[PDB]
Design a protein around this ligand. Sequence first.
Ligand SMILES: [Zn+2]
Length: 7
Amino acid sequence: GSNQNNF
Ligand SMILES: [Zn+2]
């Protein structure tokens, strides 16, 4: 799957 981190 794809992963996104938005700090
Ligand atoms: Zn993955």
